[PDB]
């Protein structure tokens, strides 16, 4: 299984864009999918997740700004995100969690986002 990330720039402020992150490989097992961000020098925080149908969060700073959904038939979850602000910007990570008994993650490797 491998995450590969696409979408990231540089956006004005109050600007939009949206990321995907496209799944390659197979598991059969059920996963979760996130998202999160880190600015340069700081923690990697935790923004929204997919898991079953419906089954959405956000972290309270995005609410009603960014969209987390999913294309099943491409693998793929994207986050759209509307009305960037300079706290926005950051690293943009994709990840999941796999799995029942033990759980496998894997971590897509990074998209910027920069807000003017």
């Known amino acids: 299984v491998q995450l590969v990330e696409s979408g990231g720039g540089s956006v004005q402020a109050g600007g939009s864009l949206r990321l995907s992150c496209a799944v390659s490989?197979?598991?059969?097992?059920?996963?979760?999918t996130g998202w999160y961000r880190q600015a340069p020098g700081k923690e990697r925080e935790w923004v929204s997740s997919?898991?079953?149908?419906?089954?959405?969060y956000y972290q309270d700073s995005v609410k009603g700004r960014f969209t987390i959904s999913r294309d099943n038939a491409k693998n793929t979850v994207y986050l759209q995100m509307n009305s960037l602000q300079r706290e926005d910007t950051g690293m943009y990570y994709c990840?999941?969690?796999?799995?029942?008994?033990?759980?496998?993650?894997?971590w897509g490797q990074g998209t910027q986002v920069t807000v003017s």
């Open positions: 990840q999941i969690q796999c799995g029942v008994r033990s759980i496998r993650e894997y």
């Open positions: 490989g197979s598991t059969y097992s059920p996963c979760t």
């Open positions: 997919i898991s079953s149908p419906g089954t959405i």
